[PDB]
Amino acid sequence: IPKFFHFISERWPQISQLIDGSQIPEFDNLYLDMNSILHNCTHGRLSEEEVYSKIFSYIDHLFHTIKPKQTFYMAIDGVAPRAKMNQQRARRFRTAMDAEKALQKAFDSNAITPGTEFMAKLTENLKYFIHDKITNDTRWQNVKVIFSGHEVPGEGQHKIMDYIRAIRAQEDYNPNTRHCIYGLDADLIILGLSTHDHHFCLLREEVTTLETQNFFLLHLSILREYLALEFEEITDSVQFEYDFERVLDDFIFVLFTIGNDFLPNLPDLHLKKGAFPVLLQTFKEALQHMDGYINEQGKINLARFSIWLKYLSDFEYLNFEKKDIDVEWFNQQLENISLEGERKRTRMGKKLLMKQQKKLIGAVKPWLLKTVQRKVTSDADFEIFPLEDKELVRANLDFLKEFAFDLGLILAHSKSKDLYYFKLDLDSIXXXXXXXXXXXXXXXXXXXYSERFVEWKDQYYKDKDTDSLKEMTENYVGGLQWVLYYYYRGCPSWSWYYRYHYAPRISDVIKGIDQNIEFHKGQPFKPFQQLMAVLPERSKNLIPVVYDFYPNEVVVKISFVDQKRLVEAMAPYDAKLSPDEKKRNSFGTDLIFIFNPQVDTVYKTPLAGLFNDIEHNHCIEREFIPESMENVKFLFGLPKGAKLGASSLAGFPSLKTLPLTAELAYNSSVVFNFPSKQQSMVLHIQDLYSLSDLAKRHMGKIVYSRWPFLRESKLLSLITEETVYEGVKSGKLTKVIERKPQDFERKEFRELKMTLKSNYQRTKAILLDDISALAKVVPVNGLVRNSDGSYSKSFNETIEYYPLQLIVEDVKNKDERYIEKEPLPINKEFPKGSKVVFLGDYAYGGEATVDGYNSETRLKLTVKKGSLRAEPNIGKVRAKLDSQALRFYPTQXXXXXXXXXXXXXXXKTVADWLSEARKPFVVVSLESDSLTKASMAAVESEIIKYVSLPDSSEQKKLAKVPREAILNAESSYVLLRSQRFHLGDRVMYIQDSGKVPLHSKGTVVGYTSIGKNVSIQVLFDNEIIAGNNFGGRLQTRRGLGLDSSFLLNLSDRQLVY
């Protein structure tokens, strides 16, 4: 849907988190919607090795970003239902055209379709990679890997949905399963929402090399929390039981009604112009004038939906009777609509009042006229008229009392106020047949589209007064229903489709609701038939060469295939296929891949270049995956005992942790590049209320900063205008010192508070009180081993400041990866057979095996020295060459700078001359440099020859080794990160998982610190299937940026002996 991400992002400004090497949550399941990857990896012809090198690198990259713990699910599109073949076929035709049209005059992407020759190879390759991965990557060894390849019918997107639905449906489903779906499509956000699983993210890539690309977690937990805020505003007004999850479901129907892949878009919605607030507003008002929800678990209530339609119809109509449409116009439409709903609801209320008012006089009349039929003499000699809705009596006392006054009555009650009634005002009195006339008079008193429009709409249909419009219409309405069922319940039909290229006018969809809609499940095309129903006589050569409906000319008004005509026109040629084509023209099953150490088989590569066979270290099997359905219903909405809000698993955000107040407003929020012109959910934060015992309680303790995304951070001081509260480790107990601020502190504090409050307004639509104190904190960046074998919380050296009001003291669910642990005995901490990294001079970085223990403090190992040849030399040499070749000076700035300031002055010149000079950009963070492009290459050439000199390995039984000559690279990210690296330094990949084979050496060609996290750019000795040429700077895939935590530095040996 056209601005959907953009609009959602600005309106609800905290939904998505940049992945930047800081800790992200843990996930149980990762699902890949892979089709975009294949496309993206087969453009920028390049070779099969290069192509699959990219794809494996991508899947593998995403796999390591999340680190799923239970299930990793990969999906490729199989054969789609017919609802999609027209667009499949439109797309496909446009690709062969544009290829011929462009490129050719002024690889066939269309191969990526099921049944194709390319795709049979793809599955063969992909299997190999999964097998290579499960064998060698330890991370890939404790998850179910499930492959649903193109051999199985259905969209990846949909096949994923059908898995999630099948597992959540069980009666042992983990209620708080953490889900993550990768994919470019903004729709996944909606399917995501459709699942009603609170703990759910989307892995996305930016929308303004692989290791330098930006990815995001879009967090459905905070999105929901925002959505709740969006719709709570009612609760009190709707005429049924308010339920957020049901509101959400209707909001989802609305979103599909606005855009989805199958039906074509309703005309003139005006999204890229600001209608979105309005459309939404439409739904908000509609939900208040209905008897229940539009969406019964994906079944649509047409009667209800038409109440919504009416608003959509007025929308269409009002906007036709406008000139241009811009934001200015939709902002004032938004207002009018809100004001109408208010007025409408106030009248509804007046009407309800009058009705009550009439029943009341209507019931009083008879009893009053009988009562006044008796002339007074000389109280219990009359009937009392009880009133029963005390709550409604109470809201109406001036009226009741005036009514009582007028009719000659008292409104009485009881001491306990549990009973109200009327009674004759007897204590207030002959031809008083004028009382009976006064009574009767008082009783009497209370008893008191356009036509240019139609034509303009007619001139639309003609262009692309009947009952074949009832037919279009009903096709569309049927569509909506097919779309919802598709998403909430499963494909309801392999054969249904929308038979038109265009949508009806909004104010006509009405004509289409007068139907009763069912579907017939059907069955999917065989691959080859789908191959024919899609694909032009311009990429004919992907179809088994053996085979109108196929223009060379064609909003793509491509004709709709006649299915019946087709299955038949092919069946002649049916019996003539190979055995491979009869293979390709059938269906597969999902496959499941397991790790098994007692498997030891040879796996032959279907690939050249850098790939080889998976040897005596091959350890996977494939199998058919089942599912195990039964007499099981789907579960719709949250599972029983699902944690939400402040009780969410660690890592997932929540707004519920602070106390606050939310309000839609025009906050000019700046989530992207320019300030939004629409309302945001502005968050007004409430201060929590001493400040001295606060410091005393939390100083040097464990606090939670970064509100939204609560995180473990130690409290360092508590700045204030006039007082600093500091923490000093007294040894055991850290204590609080209170003092006046130094001038720069008092400067910073004023400059900081002003900067925070406005960044929180501008960037996140958080309106802060106004800054009382300021917690200064450092966040937990892992665990770290002490001398005594225990492990404790490590902290990032970089100071962060947070207003105190955003500081949370504690949280139900604490991040397990940061539970501090007690010491362990040798045999448990380095179990016999465990593989470890040898420190110590014999093989710094050698593969070690724990054989036994010599004491309970010393152990014995086998150390493989991987190489008996000196480390190569060039990196170091060239690092000194560059530094001697490019000298720096203090102001009182590089020799190249001197030559630019000498060129500019000698020309007196300007200005563009200067913009012209600025072309070769050397723009990067402060601690981060590089080898000169020349040096890079020199290092490459010198390596290529080094890595081909004869060389051998060597093992050695070792004994009496103390525990600190060995480490577990697994669980030493922090130590490893604590190492200096310099240009030229020799290095080794030390981790048992990731994109480099264990123990590979390389040379540091340049470092890159994104503030706190350092990324080392390694030129590797061997080529790396996961590498790149650092953008042409190299001639082979020897290059990789990587996190220090992956690397043992061999030149500047900082963990030896």
mmCIF file of C-alpha atoms in Angstrom, residues 232-536:
data_model
loop_
_atom_site.group_PDB
_atom_site.id
_atom_site.type_symbol
_atom_site.label_atom_id
_atom_site.label_comp_id
_atom_site.label_asym_id
_atom_site.label_seq_id
_atom_site.Cartn_x
_atom_site.Cartn_y
_atom_site.Cartn_z
ATOM 1 C CA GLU A 232 -9.079 3.671 22.892
ATOM 2 C CA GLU A 233 -10.489 7.163 22.424
ATOM 3 C CA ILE A 234 -13.766 5.289 21.839
ATOM 4 C CA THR A 235 -14.257 2.353 24.241
ATOM 5 C CA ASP A 236 -16.997 4.443 25.888
ATOM 6 C CA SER A 237 -18.797 5.233 22.590
ATOM 7 C CA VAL A 238 -19.106 1.891 20.676
ATOM 8 C CA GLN A 239 -22.423 -0.012 20.904
ATOM 9 C CA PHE A 240 -20.873 -3.484 21.658
ATOM 10 C CA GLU A 241 -18.055 -4.893 23.820
ATOM 11 C CA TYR A 242 -14.840 -2.936 22.949
ATOM 12 C CA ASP A 243 -11.913 -5.256 22.387
ATOM 13 C CA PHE A 244 -8.603 -4.055 21.031
ATOM 14 C CA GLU A 245 -7.791 -7.286 19.267
ATOM 15 C CA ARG A 246 -11.149 -7.117 17.447
ATOM 16 C CA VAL A 247 -10.679 -3.495 16.632
ATOM 17 C CA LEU A 248 -7.219 -4.480 15.252
ATOM 18 C CA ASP A 249 -8.813 -7.164 13.046
ATOM 19 C CA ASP A 250 -11.231 -4.594 11.616
ATOM 20 C CA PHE A 251 -8.396 -2.175 11.100
ATOM 21 C CA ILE A 252 -6.758 -4.885 9.099
ATOM 22 C CA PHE A 253 -9.790 -5.413 6.933
ATOM 23 C CA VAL A 254 -9.743 -1.676 6.317
ATOM 24 C CA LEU A 255 -6.063 -1.805 5.348
ATOM 25 C CA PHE A 256 -6.635 -4.637 2.841
ATOM 26 C CA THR A 257 -9.691 -2.911 1.494
ATOM 27 C CA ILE A 258 -7.381 0.016 0.779
ATOM 28 C CA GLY A 259 -4.675 -1.969 -1.018
ATOM 29 C CA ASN A 260 -3.693 -5.599 -1.421
ATOM 30 C CA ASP A 261 -1.869 -7.529 -4.191
ATOM 31 C CA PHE A 262 -4.817 -9.282 -5.824
ATOM 32 C CA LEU A 263 -7.710 -6.816 -6.378
ATOM 33 C CA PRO A 264 -6.836 -3.518 -8.127
ATOM 34 C CA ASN A 265 -6.826 -0.381 -6.079
ATOM 35 C CA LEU A 266 -10.035 1.593 -5.595
ATOM 36 C CA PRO A 267 -9.634 4.747 -7.773
ATOM 37 C CA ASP A 268 -8.685 8.174 -6.378
ATOM 38 C CA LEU A 269 -7.753 7.140 -2.763
ATOM 39 C CA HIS A 270 -5.078 9.907 -2.905
ATOM 40 C CA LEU A 271 -2.634 8.283 -0.518
ATOM 41 C CA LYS A 272 0.527 10.077 -1.729
ATOM 42 C CA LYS A 273 -1.398 13.251 -0.856
ATOM 43 C CA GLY A 274 -2.525 12.753 2.737
ATOM 44 C CA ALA A 275 -5.854 10.893 2.575
ATOM 45 C CA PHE A 276 -4.521 8.346 5.011
ATOM 46 C CA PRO A 277 -5.439 10.223 8.205
ATOM 47 C CA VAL A 278 -8.873 10.738 6.685
ATOM 48 C CA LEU A 279 -9.399 7.129 5.621
ATOM 49 C CA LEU A 280 -8.526 6.053 9.150
ATOM 50 C CA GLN A 281 -10.784 8.741 10.563
ATOM 51 C CA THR A 282 -13.496 7.189 8.469
ATOM 52 C CA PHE A 283 -13.018 3.893 10.129
ATOM 53 C CA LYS A 284 -12.865 5.473 13.578
ATOM 54 C CA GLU A 285 -16.217 7.175 13.082
ATOM 55 C CA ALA A 286 -17.719 4.087 11.402
ATOM 56 C CA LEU A 287 -16.869 1.820 14.285
ATOM 57 C CA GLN A 288 -19.214 3.919 16.445
ATOM 58 C CA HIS A 289 -22.339 3.513 14.290
ATOM 59 C CA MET A 290 -22.451 -0.273 14.037
ATOM 60 C CA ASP A 291 -23.688 -3.191 16.145
ATOM 61 C CA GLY A 292 -20.465 -5.269 16.249
ATOM 62 C CA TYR A 293 -17.318 -5.902 14.266
ATOM 63 C CA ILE A 294 -16.880 -5.904 10.477
ATOM 64 C CA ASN A 295 -14.455 -8.904 10.733
ATOM 65 C CA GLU A 296 -15.365 -12.337 12.205
ATOM 66 C CA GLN A 297 -11.958 -14.030 12.008
ATOM 67 C CA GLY A 298 -11.688 -13.115 8.336
ATOM 68 C CA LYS A 299 -15.415 -13.498 7.574
ATOM 69 C CA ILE A 300 -16.705 -10.106 6.479
ATOM 70 C CA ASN A 301 -20.094 -8.655 7.628
ATOM 71 C CA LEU A 302 -21.382 -6.904 4.500
ATOM 72 C CA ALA A 303 -24.194 -5.118 6.378
ATOM 73 C CA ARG A 304 -21.588 -3.651 8.692
ATOM 74 C CA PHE A 305 -19.058 -2.974 5.973
ATOM 75 C CA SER A 306 -21.522 -0.814 4.062
ATOM 76 C CA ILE A 307 -21.825 1.583 7.040
ATOM 77 C CA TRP A 308 -18.099 2.025 6.543
ATOM 78 C CA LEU A 309 -18.545 2.301 2.764
ATOM 79 C CA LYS A 310 -20.913 5.235 3.091
ATOM 80 C CA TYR A 311 -18.065 7.273 4.615
ATOM 81 C CA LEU A 312 -15.793 6.095 1.837
ATOM 82 C CA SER A 313 -18.446 7.115 -0.690
ATOM 83 C CA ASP A 314 -18.837 10.670 0.801
ATOM 84 C CA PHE A 315 -15.043 10.773 0.655
ATOM 85 C CA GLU A 316 -14.959 9.962 -3.034
ATOM 86 C CA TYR A 317 -17.798 12.362 -3.708
ATOM 87 C CA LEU A 318 -16.456 15.370 -1.755
ATOM 88 C CA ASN A 319 -13.057 15.038 -3.433
ATOM 89 C CA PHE A 320 -14.500 15.004 -6.977
ATOM 90 C CA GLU A 321 -16.096 18.357 -6.119
ATOM 91 C CA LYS A 322 -12.583 19.678 -5.327
ATOM 92 C CA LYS A 323 -9.862 21.019 -7.640
ATOM 93 C CA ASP A 324 -6.388 19.727 -6.768
ATOM 94 C CA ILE A 325 -6.099 17.607 -3.670
ATOM 95 C CA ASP A 326 -3.187 18.290 -1.278
ATOM 96 C CA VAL A 327 -2.406 17.974 2.446
ATOM 97 C CA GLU A 328 -4.040 21.324 3.227
ATOM 98 C CA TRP A 329 -7.370 19.929 1.905
ATOM 99 C CA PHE A 330 -7.208 16.616 3.725
ATOM 100 C CA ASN A 331 -6.256 18.254 6.985
ATOM 101 C CA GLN A 332 -9.479 20.307 6.849
ATOM 102 C CA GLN A 333 -11.479 17.241 5.781
ATOM 103 C CA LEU A 334 -10.182 15.327 8.786
ATOM 104 C CA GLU A 335 -11.510 18.152 11.012
ATOM 105 C CA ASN A 336 -14.943 18.312 9.374
ATOM 106 C CA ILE A 337 -15.355 14.534 9.748
ATOM 107 C CA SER A 338 -14.439 14.579 13.427
ATOM 108 C CA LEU A 339 -16.763 17.482 14.061
ATOM 109 C CA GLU A 340 -19.540 15.639 12.279
ATOM 110 C CA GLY A 341 -19.115 12.511 14.352
ATOM 111 C CA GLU A 342 -19.301 14.687 17.479
ATOM 112 C CA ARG A 343 -22.404 16.511 16.345
ATOM 113 C CA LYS A 344 -23.941 13.227 15.196
ATOM 114 C CA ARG A 345 -23.322 11.546 18.565
ATOM 115 C CA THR A 346 -24.674 14.545 20.484
ATOM 116 C CA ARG A 347 -27.945 14.338 18.507
ATOM 117 C CA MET A 348 -28.063 10.620 18.976
ATOM 118 C CA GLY A 349 -27.873 11.422 22.661
ATOM 119 C CA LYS A 350 -30.570 14.128 22.570
ATOM 120 C CA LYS A 351 -32.828 11.629 20.770
ATOM 121 C CA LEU A 352 -32.184 8.968 23.442
ATOM 122 C CA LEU A 353 -33.038 11.584 26.096
ATOM 123 C CA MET A 354 -36.314 12.611 24.470
ATOM 124 C CA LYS A 355 -37.385 8.980 24.119
ATOM 125 C CA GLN A 356 -36.867 8.461 27.852
ATOM 126 C CA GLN A 357 -38.627 11.712 28.490
ATOM 127 C CA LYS A 358 -41.692 10.441 26.571
ATOM 128 C CA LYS A 359 -41.926 6.985 28.140
ATOM 129 C CA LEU A 360 -41.764 8.865 31.423
ATOM 130 C CA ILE A 361 -44.689 11.336 30.884
ATOM 131 C CA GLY A 362 -46.461 8.471 29.155
ATOM 132 C CA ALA A 363 -46.265 6.361 32.330
ATOM 133 C CA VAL A 364 -46.965 9.243 34.749
ATOM 134 C CA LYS A 365 -50.145 10.624 32.991
ATOM 135 C CA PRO A 366 -52.489 7.764 33.929
ATOM 136 C CA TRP A 367 -51.230 7.530 37.539
ATOM 137 C CA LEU A 368 -51.152 11.303 37.933
ATOM 138 C CA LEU A 369 -54.724 11.844 36.582
ATOM 139 C CA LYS A 370 -56.078 9.069 38.886
ATOM 140 C CA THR A 371 -54.170 10.635 41.822
ATOM 141 C CA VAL A 372 -55.565 14.138 41.242
ATOM 142 C CA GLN A 373 -59.036 12.619 40.981
ATOM 143 C CA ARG A 374 -59.256 12.737 44.825
ATOM 144 C CA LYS A 375 -59.805 16.057 46.627
ATOM 145 C CA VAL A 376 -57.753 16.650 49.793
ATOM 146 C CA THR A 377 -59.178 16.381 53.328
ATOM 147 C CA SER A 378 -57.251 16.036 56.680
ATOM 148 C CA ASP A 379 -50.084 10.897 52.493
ATOM 149 C CA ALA A 380 -50.147 7.100 52.504
ATOM 150 C CA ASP A 381 -53.680 7.595 51.135
ATOM 151 C CA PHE A 382 -52.098 7.766 47.605
ATOM 152 C CA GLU A 383 -49.955 5.613 45.355
ATOM 153 C CA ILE A 384 -46.262 6.427 44.995
ATOM 154 C CA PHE A 385 -44.678 6.204 41.515
ATOM 155 C CA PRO A 386 -41.290 4.478 41.922
ATOM 156 C CA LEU A 387 -38.502 5.364 39.448
ATOM 157 C CA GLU A 388 -36.015 2.557 38.849
ATOM 158 C CA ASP A 389 -32.900 3.591 36.926
ATOM 159 C CA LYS A 390 -31.216 5.419 39.849
ATOM 160 C CA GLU A 391 -28.147 6.142 37.696
ATOM 161 C CA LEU A 392 -30.329 7.808 35.036
ATOM 162 C CA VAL A 393 -32.496 9.594 37.637
ATOM 163 C CA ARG A 394 -29.300 10.937 39.158
ATOM 164 C CA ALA A 395 -28.063 12.377 35.867
ATOM 165 C CA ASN A 396 -31.315 14.247 35.440
ATOM 166 C CA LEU A 397 -32.256 15.783 38.733
ATOM 167 C CA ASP A 398 -32.875 19.386 37.617
ATOM 168 C CA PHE A 399 -35.308 18.015 35.007
ATOM 169 C CA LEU A 400 -36.987 15.485 37.280
ATOM 170 C CA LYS A 401 -37.245 18.124 39.984
ATOM 171 C CA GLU A 402 -38.732 20.681 37.572
ATOM 172 C CA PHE A 403 -41.070 18.011 36.191
ATOM 173 C CA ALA A 404 -42.064 17.215 39.762
ATOM 174 C CA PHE A 405 -42.499 20.911 40.490
ATOM 175 C CA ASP A 406 -44.725 21.433 37.429
ATOM 176 C CA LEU A 407 -46.987 18.433 37.813
ATOM 177 C CA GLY A 408 -47.580 19.248 41.504
ATOM 178 C CA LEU A 409 -45.360 16.378 42.580
ATOM 179 C CA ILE A 410 -42.351 15.746 44.793
ATOM 180 C CA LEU A 411 -39.342 13.748 43.723
ATOM 181 C CA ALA A 412 -38.685 11.813 46.907
ATOM 182 C CA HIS A 413 -36.100 9.278 47.988
ATOM 183 C CA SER A 414 -34.987 7.075 50.926
ATOM 184 C CA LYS A 415 -32.358 7.768 53.546
ATOM 185 C CA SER A 416 -30.116 5.074 51.955
ATOM 186 C CA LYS A 417 -30.909 6.563 48.515
ATOM 187 C CA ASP A 418 -31.681 3.090 47.160
ATOM 188 C CA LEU A 419 -35.148 4.042 45.996
ATOM 189 C CA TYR A 420 -36.432 7.142 44.208
ATOM 190 C CA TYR A 421 -40.081 7.895 43.459
ATOM 191 C CA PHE A 422 -42.623 10.563 42.796
ATOM 192 C CA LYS A 423 -45.508 11.388 45.162
ATOM 193 C CA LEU A 424 -48.314 13.939 45.182
ATOM 194 C CA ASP A 425 -47.170 17.131 46.834
ATOM 195 C CA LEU A 426 -49.931 16.791 49.352
ATOM 196 C CA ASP A 427 -48.317 19.263 51.839
ATOM 197 C CA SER A 428 -49.320 22.079 49.517
ATOM 198 C CA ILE A 429 -53.144 22.378 49.757
ATOM 199 C CA UNK A 430 -63.464 24.184 46.840
ATOM 200 C CA UNK A 431 -63.729 23.737 43.113
ATOM 201 C CA UNK A 432 -60.058 22.722 42.913
ATOM 202 C CA UNK A 433 -61.131 21.024 39.657
ATOM 203 C CA UNK A 434 -58.603 23.683 38.566
ATOM 204 C CA UNK A 435 -55.885 21.537 40.140
ATOM 205 C CA UNK A 436 -57.123 18.772 37.807
ATOM 206 C CA UNK A 437 -56.957 21.324 34.904
ATOM 207 C CA UNK A 438 -53.575 22.659 36.072
ATOM 208 C CA UNK A 439 -52.370 19.016 36.249
ATOM 209 C CA UNK A 440 -53.788 18.339 32.759
ATOM 210 C CA UNK A 441 -52.214 21.495 31.288
ATOM 211 C CA UNK A 442 -48.843 20.707 32.831
ATOM 212 C CA UNK A 443 -49.079 17.127 31.497
ATOM 213 C CA UNK A 444 -49.995 18.502 28.074
ATOM 214 C CA UNK A 445 -46.912 20.758 28.127
ATOM 215 C CA UNK A 446 -44.376 17.847 28.498
ATOM 216 C CA UNK A 447 -46.044 15.787 25.775
ATOM 217 C CA UNK A 448 -44.360 18.381 23.483
ATOM 218 C CA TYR A 449 -25.335 12.445 -4.994
ATOM 219 C CA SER A 450 -24.665 15.091 -7.674
ATOM 220 C CA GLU A 451 -25.516 14.602 -11.338
ATOM 221 C CA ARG A 452 -22.221 15.817 -12.818
ATOM 222 C CA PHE A 453 -20.990 13.150 -10.438
ATOM 223 C CA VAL A 454 -23.062 10.266 -11.877
ATOM 224 C CA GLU A 455 -21.966 11.299 -15.366
ATOM 225 C CA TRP A 456 -18.285 11.622 -14.445
ATOM 226 C CA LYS A 457 -18.581 8.123 -12.955
ATOM 227 C CA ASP A 458 -20.372 6.817 -16.003
ATOM 228 C CA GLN A 459 -17.623 8.346 -18.161
ATOM 229 C CA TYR A 460 -15.163 6.270 -16.121
ATOM 230 C CA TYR A 461 -16.734 2.833 -16.763
ATOM 231 C CA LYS A 462 -17.380 3.400 -20.448
ATOM 232 C CA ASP A 463 -13.718 4.492 -20.663
ATOM 233 C CA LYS A 464 -12.434 1.093 -19.266
ATOM 234 C CA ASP A 465 -26.294 2.506 -16.361
ATOM 235 C CA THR A 466 -26.555 -1.340 -16.312
ATOM 236 C CA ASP A 467 -26.162 -4.533 -14.245
ATOM 237 C CA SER A 468 -22.958 -5.764 -15.769
ATOM 238 C CA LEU A 469 -21.780 -3.218 -13.093
ATOM 239 C CA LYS A 470 -23.562 -5.386 -10.552
ATOM 240 C CA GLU A 471 -21.301 -8.025 -12.065
ATOM 241 C CA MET A 472 -17.997 -6.069 -11.818
ATOM 242 C CA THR A 473 -18.918 -4.863 -8.404
ATOM 243 C CA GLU A 474 -19.784 -8.309 -7.129
ATOM 244 C CA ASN A 475 -16.483 -9.592 -8.462
ATOM 245 C CA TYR A 476 -14.674 -6.928 -6.458
ATOM 246 C CA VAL A 477 -16.645 -7.472 -3.273
ATOM 247 C CA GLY A 478 -16.009 -11.210 -3.732
ATOM 248 C CA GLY A 479 -12.349 -10.292 -3.980
ATOM 249 C CA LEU A 480 -12.221 -8.488 -0.675
ATOM 250 C CA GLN A 481 -13.659 -11.601 0.846
ATOM 251 C CA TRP A 482 -11.144 -13.824 -0.946
ATOM 252 C CA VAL A 483 -8.290 -11.581 0.254
ATOM 253 C CA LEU A 484 -9.327 -11.692 3.910
ATOM 254 C CA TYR A 485 -9.942 -15.440 3.910
ATOM 255 C CA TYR A 486 -6.567 -15.844 2.222
ATOM 256 C CA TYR A 487 -4.851 -13.985 5.068
ATOM 257 C CA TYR A 488 -6.889 -15.072 8.124
ATOM 258 C CA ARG A 489 -7.659 -18.642 7.191
ATOM 259 C CA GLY A 490 -5.839 -20.006 4.086
ATOM 260 C CA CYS A 491 -6.297 -19.838 0.321
ATOM 261 C CA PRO A 492 -10.005 -20.316 -0.081
ATOM 262 C CA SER A 493 -9.674 -20.952 -3.836
ATOM 263 C CA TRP A 494 -6.991 -21.822 -6.311
ATOM 264 C CA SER A 495 -9.181 -20.621 -9.136
ATOM 265 C CA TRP A 496 -11.072 -17.465 -8.072
ATOM 266 C CA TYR A 497 -9.754 -14.229 -9.691
ATOM 267 C CA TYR A 498 -10.852 -10.591 -10.369
ATOM 268 C CA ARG A 499 -11.843 -10.479 -14.029
ATOM 269 C CA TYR A 500 -11.170 -6.817 -14.745
ATOM 270 C CA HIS A 501 -8.226 -4.519 -14.938
ATOM 271 C CA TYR A 502 -9.863 -1.780 -12.934
ATOM 272 C CA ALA A 503 -11.784 -1.225 -9.726
ATOM 273 C CA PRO A 504 -15.226 0.239 -9.607
ATOM 274 C CA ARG A 505 -15.794 3.678 -8.171
ATOM 275 C CA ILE A 506 -15.936 3.695 -4.394
ATOM 276 C CA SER A 507 -19.474 5.002 -4.362
ATOM 277 C CA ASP A 508 -20.530 1.889 -6.369
ATOM 278 C CA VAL A 509 -19.077 -0.933 -4.342
ATOM 279 C CA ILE A 510 -22.551 -0.888 -2.651
ATOM 280 C CA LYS A 511 -24.084 -2.596 -5.713
ATOM 281 C CA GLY A 512 -21.859 -5.545 -4.977
ATOM 282 C CA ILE A 513 -22.749 -6.453 -1.434
ATOM 283 C CA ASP A 514 -26.095 -7.996 -2.275
ATOM 284 C CA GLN A 515 -24.541 -11.419 -2.677
ATOM 285 C CA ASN A 516 -23.932 -14.567 -0.719
ATOM 286 C CA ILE A 517 -20.257 -15.488 -1.170
ATOM 287 C CA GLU A 518 -18.781 -18.941 -1.144
ATOM 288 C CA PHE A 519 -15.710 -20.456 -2.778
ATOM 289 C CA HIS A 520 -14.573 -23.839 -4.066
ATOM 290 C CA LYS A 521 -11.141 -24.912 -2.891
ATOM 291 C CA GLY A 522 -10.012 -26.085 -6.386
ATOM 292 C CA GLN A 523 -6.403 -27.156 -6.964
ATOM 293 C CA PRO A 524 -3.222 -25.413 -8.287
ATOM 294 C CA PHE A 525 -1.966 -25.619 -11.888
ATOM 295 C CA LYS A 526 0.718 -28.068 -12.680
ATOM 296 C CA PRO A 527 4.030 -26.102 -12.921
ATOM 297 C CA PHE A 528 4.200 -26.134 -16.735
ATOM 298 C CA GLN A 529 0.593 -24.910 -17.167
ATOM 299 C CA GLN A 530 1.320 -22.067 -14.814
ATOM 300 C CA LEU A 531 4.522 -21.618 -16.711
ATOM 301 C CA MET A 532 2.358 -21.095 -19.790
ATOM 302 C CA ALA A 533 -0.373 -18.946 -18.168
ATOM 303 C CA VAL A 534 2.495 -16.554 -17.284
ATOM 304 C CA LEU A 535 5.469 -15.818 -19.572
ATOM 305 C CA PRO A 536 5.515 -14.217 -22.970
#
